[PDB]
Design a protein around this ligand. Structure first.
Ligand SMILES: CNCc1nnc2ccccn12
Lengths: 39, 156
């Protein structure tokens, strides 16, 4: 059985930790909602 | 149950202990999450019940109590924040510049941030705090890292 619990407000936070790259990828989306890489 | 706007954990007691299977957004009395988190099942909020209202396996999205309300979009230029809600850990904002998923049906923003699967449903925000999509449906790249689409629904 599934239940929900509040975890916070939705707000932008100044000086949050900045990380992650920005890859440009060729992808395909199948009928089951699964993404796959196209090469 | 609780109907206040904000980010929520999605939990289950079916397995060992209490397990976080995902996250979701409550906005305008409607709870939004990814379809693979709940598989369209009903949810409980205290004593109250949330019934699914709309869902789509291909978009991998579902809304409870009403129609999908989130309609803000990534501008294609600016940095965004993932409001990550990891299992057993406090909600935390992470800023990143999205990449792009290029598809035969158009381009979609993508965030290259790697978190446990139970973080799926965490909202991605623009600089005004608007939810431009949810984290958790994506792909695994050459190096083994995870890249999620910025998945957004349509507000009818
Ligand atoms: C819940 N299944 C989707 C999924 N599979 N690996 C990851 C990693 C991060 C977020 C979502 N993920």
């Amino acid at each position: 059985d599934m239940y929900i619990e509040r975890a916070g407000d939705i707000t932008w936070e100044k000086d949050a930790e900045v990380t992650g790259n920005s890859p440009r990828l060729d992808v395909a989306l199948d009928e089951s909602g699964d993404f796959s890489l196209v090469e | 149950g609780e109907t206040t706007d904000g980010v929520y954990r999605v939990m289950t007691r079916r397995l060992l202990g209490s397990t976080q299977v995902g996250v979701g957004v409550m906005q305008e009395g409607v709870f939004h999450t990814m379809w693979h988190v709940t598989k369209g099942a009903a949810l409980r909020s205290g004593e109250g019940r949330l019934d699914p209202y709309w869902g789509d396996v291909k978009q991998d999205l579902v809304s409870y109590c009403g129609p999908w309300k989130l309609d803000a979009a990534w501008d294609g230029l600016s940095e965004v924040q993932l409001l990550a809600v990891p299992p057993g850990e406090r909600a935390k904002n992470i800023q990143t510049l999205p990449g792009i998923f290029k598809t035969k049906d158009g381009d979609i923003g993508a965030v290259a941030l790697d978190y446990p699967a139970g973080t799926s449903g965490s909202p991605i925000l623009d600089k005004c705090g608007r939810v431009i999509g949810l984290y958790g449906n994506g792909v695994v790249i050459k190096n083994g890292s995870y890249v999620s689409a910025i998945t957004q629904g349509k507000r009818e």
